[PDB]
Design a binder for this molecule. Structure first.
Ligand SMILES: Nc1nc2c(ncn2[C@@H]2O[C@H](COP(=O)(O)CP(=O)(O)OP(=O)(O)O)[C@@H](O)[C@H]2O)c(=O)[nH]1
Ligand SMILES: Nc1nc2c(ncn2[C@@H]2O[C@H](COP(=O)(O)OP(=O)(O)OP(=O)(O)O)[C@@H](O)[C@H]2O)c(=O)[nH]1
Ligand SMILES: [Mg+2]
Ligand SMILES: [Mg+2]
Lengths: 426, 347
């Protein structure tokens, strides 16, 4: 009961997905072969949420891997945990998208997509009651953004009543990796606005800051960064996988955190986060976790929560904890930091608690905030788009893939409207 | 510059023979043109209830039409000036509203029979326009679309299937691939629309044999130019828009069909979105401190209607209710919505 379907689109998305799978298999006591070697019966009770049971006491991720390039697939298959995936669930093209949203959405991606659709239909049929979909990808390139968006549109058309979740790695301001990133982000964000029910805005710059400042990590690799994201992902759906004292799944979270249809862009966070040295000089207690989570410098989106207000915040706690203590701490934070919370939604905080902690830790926390500061992310992007579009820079490539200028105009308008709406509700 | 103007009226249907045969009591009374009272049929057994007298539930309107009101009377005393606004180069919008089964389609649009005010709207439009046409050539174009699960069906020409919305240079809203018929008479547009009704998604629900599953949106564009076509012209394209709002639904207790549950939710969501858009437009029109974005984005209905809703336009909400206590709850909710559509405490 309550099966989730996982989709990974483009290189980054795939990489994050791999990490996610690795963590979750470890959590549920699943080895690199698909066999359960755990101790606790609780690890297998709700195994069906993320895994299909294959013949001969093995488990396989309900995961679809998508890319316009084959190399990524190979890299995944050769990775630790690569062999756990169903071979028929790898759907790859041969060409690539060349950082072009149009190639991913209209051309190469279009050709690819039917196969993916066929796979995912089968995966849906297999599951007794699919609660919904989780897509991991980025907005800045061509595949994850254009192809991903296309896929999402198709999915929603066939499953309009199911929950649609995306973990979207967004382009940061300073660390600009590509030149057409503004275009790709703009086009994809628009589509996300209409077709996702909740969107987790993850930002590389913020991750780097976390790694450098909070973990004090000498050399971050993408794997390390990805780990953080994976942890966050695991946090959200802990209530579907384990028992607890107060239980909240994907739907319950959405209903409590989304007051208006369009405002479904979250700034996620995780706690605790310490170095090796600073491990000894700390208190493993709920007050400390709470303190950590609400800090601006612990957000995985490059936005200052102190530049806006929280519309709603959901906190998900894992480990053996006193409910009273949890409640006290959340009330204290809202009373003390009154100015950071919208005053016309009393009790801006939703709490959920799962008894089963993550491995290595006795207590852990996951944060989901709907903050009006997310407007900053959109605004910058809009500005950059304007700067490009005013001089029609790089437009020709997109138009060569069948795209028309008017779409760009529309998307930009839409994003502007969204920004305005956030501002006004602040 | 939101200068939004919306009149709110309501038509009380005459109590039907079926309602009389079923013992229906008259919950609806009209005290004035401005107001209607719904007599909530409480048993009043407690001293508190007898003291509070909650039975007298008042709602605020510009014009409440009683049980004897006809399609011609609704036209003459409500949309008539909206037609004029379009003739004069402005946009205007009419919204039919109520619980499904309320008779919205027949009061406003018709379906071959019961011409509705839509016939009356076009009948005066064309008489006035044909007269004006002597100096200013007119092209009265007509489209008819279906807004269903946020997808748009071309009703006049179903071969375009389900369409999206796009922003114009100068950001108005266009439905892609919609058929536009240029007409000269009400007979042409009325038959065009009634034919288009054949392509609407409708189902035999418990509350209504013909329950619309969608918002039926008419877009009649009164395009004009001085007949001196060789001269530069500041032409007009006033849009006379009429919306058959999907009926409100709370029939999901028995409508357990997957699609009816989906449609129900999308209908109610978009009816509420319209409500929120109206509240915002009214607040801005009033000049309140609520300076913000009007949430047209919340539905395809409101995104499209933005072009009339946010400007120097005349709009009208026409609700449909019943005097019978047997449907008290539907009348109550219908009146409540309409009251909130107006947002004026004159009653
Ligand atoms: N947080 C992470 N970000 C990544 C990772 N790999 C790439 N990226 C970021 O994503 C962007 C590059 O995206 P992709 O390689 O996924 C583009 P994709 O392969 O999906 O389509 P193509 O345009 O066909 O290459 C850029 O901002 C990178 O800095 C990762 O492992 N973690
Ligand atoms: N006294 C007490 N209250 C509880 C307990 N568990 C949850 N609550 C309270 O119950 C309310 C939340 O409702 P739940 O019972 O968890 O929700 P539910 O009935 O399962 O409804 P859904 O999960 O929304 O389907 C809150 O006021 C909690 O504080 C408990 O063990 N004891
Ligand atoms: Mg790639
Ligand atoms: Mg419950």
């Amino acid at each position: 009961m309550r099966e989730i379907v996982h989709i990974q689109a483009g290189q980054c998305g795939n990489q994050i997905g791999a990490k996610f799978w690795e963590v979750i298999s470890d959590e549920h006591g699943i080895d690199p072969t698909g066999s359960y070697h755990g101790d606790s019966d609780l690890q297998l009770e709700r195994i069906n949420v993320y895994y299909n049971e294959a013949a001969g006491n093995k488990y396989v991720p309900r995961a679809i891997l998508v890319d316009l390039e084959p190399g990524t697939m190979d890299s995944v298959r050769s990775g630790p945990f690569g062999q756990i995936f169903r071979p028929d669930n790898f759907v790859f093209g041969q060409s690539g998208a060349g950082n072009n949203w149009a190639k991913g959405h209209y051309t190469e991606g279009a050709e690819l997509v039917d196969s993916v659709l066929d796979v995912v239909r089968k995966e849906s049929e297999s599951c007794d009651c699919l609660q919904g979909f989780q897509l991991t990808h980025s907005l800045g390139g061509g595949t994850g953004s254009g192809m991903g968006t296309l896929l999402i549109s198709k999915i929603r058309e066939e499953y309009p009543d199911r929950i649609m979740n995306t973990f979207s790695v967004v382009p940061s301001p300073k660390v600009s990796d590509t030149v057409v990133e503004p275009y790709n982000a703009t086009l994809s964000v628009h589509q996300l606005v209409e077709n996702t029910d909740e969107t987790y805005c993850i930002d590389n710059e913020a991750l780097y800051d976390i790694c450098f400042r909070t973990l004090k990590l000498t050399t971050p690799t993408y794997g390390d960064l990805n780990h953080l994201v994976s942890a966050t992902m695991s946090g959200v759906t802990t209530c579907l996988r384990f028992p607890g004292q107060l239980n909240a799944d994907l739907r319950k979270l959405a209903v409590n955190m989304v007051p208006f249809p369009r405002l479904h862009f979250f700034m996620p966070g995780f706690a605790p986060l310490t170095s090796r040295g600073s491990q000894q000089y700390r208190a493993l207690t709920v007050p400390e976790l709470t303190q950590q989570m609400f800090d601006a410098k612990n957000m995985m989106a490059a936005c200052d929560p102190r530049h806006g207000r929280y519309l709603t915040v959901a906190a998900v706690f894992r480990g053996r904890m006193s409910m009273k203590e949890v409640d006290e701490q959340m009330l204290n934070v809202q009373n003390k930091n009154s100015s950071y919370f919208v005053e016309w939604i009393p009790n801006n905080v939703k709490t959920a608690v799962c008894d089963i902690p993550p491995r290595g830790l006795k207590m852990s926390a996951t944060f989901i905030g709907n903050s009006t500061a997310i407007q900053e992310l959109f605004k910058r992007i809009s500005e950059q788009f304007t700067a490009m579009f005013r001089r029609k820079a790089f437009l020709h490539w997109y138009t060569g893939e069948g795209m028309d200028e008017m779409e760009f105009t529309e998307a930009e308008s839409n994003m502007n409207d969204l920004v305005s709406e956030y501002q006004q509700y602040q | 510059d939101i200068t939004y103007n919306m009149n709110v009226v309501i038509r009380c249907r005459p109590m039907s023979n079926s309602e009389k045969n079923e013992g229906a009591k008259n919950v609806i009374k009209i005290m004035d043109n401005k107001m209607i009272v719904l007599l909530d049929p409480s048993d009043n057994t407690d001293n508190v209830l007898r003291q509070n007298r909650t039975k007298e539930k008042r709602y605020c309107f510009d014009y409440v039409f009683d049980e004897n009101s006809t399609q011609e009377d609704v036209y003459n005393n409500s949309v008539k000036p909206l037609v004029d606004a379009v003739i004069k180069g402005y946009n205007s919008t009419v919204f039919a509203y109520g619980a499904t089964g309320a008779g919205k389609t027949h009061t406003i649009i018709g379906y071959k029979n019961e011409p509705g005010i839509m016939m009356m709207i076009l009948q005066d439009l064309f008489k006035k326009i044909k007269t004006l046409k002597a100096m200013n050539e007119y092209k009265i174009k007509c489209s008819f679309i279906e807004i269903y699960n946020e997808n748009i069906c071309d009703l006049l020409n179903p071969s375009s299937e389900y369409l999206d919305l796009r922003e114009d240079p100068v950001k108005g809203i266009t439905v892609s691939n919609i058929f536009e018929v240029c007409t000269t008479s009400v007979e042409e547009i009325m038959e065009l629309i009634h034919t288009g009704n054949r392509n609407r998604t409708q189902e035999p629900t418990d509350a209504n044999r013909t329950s619309s599953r969608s918002h039926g949106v008419l877009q009649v564009i009164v395009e004009e130019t001085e007949k001196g076509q060789g001269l530069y012209q500041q032409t007009k394209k006033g849009k006379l828009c009429v919306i058959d709002l999907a009926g409100s639904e709370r029939a999901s207790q028995t409508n357990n069909k997957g699609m009816r549950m989906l449609e129900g939710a999308n209908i109610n969501r978009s009816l509420l979105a319209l409500g929120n858009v109206i509240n915002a437009l009214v607040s801005r029109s009033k000049g309140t401190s609520k300076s913000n974005f009007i949430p047209f984005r919340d539905s395809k209905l409101t995104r499209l209607l933005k072009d009339s809703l946010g400007g120097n336009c005349k709009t009208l909400m026409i609700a449909n209710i019943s005097p019978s206590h047997l449907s008290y709850e539907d009348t109550h909710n219908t009146l409540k919505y309409a009251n909130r559509a107006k947002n004026i405490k004159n009653v």
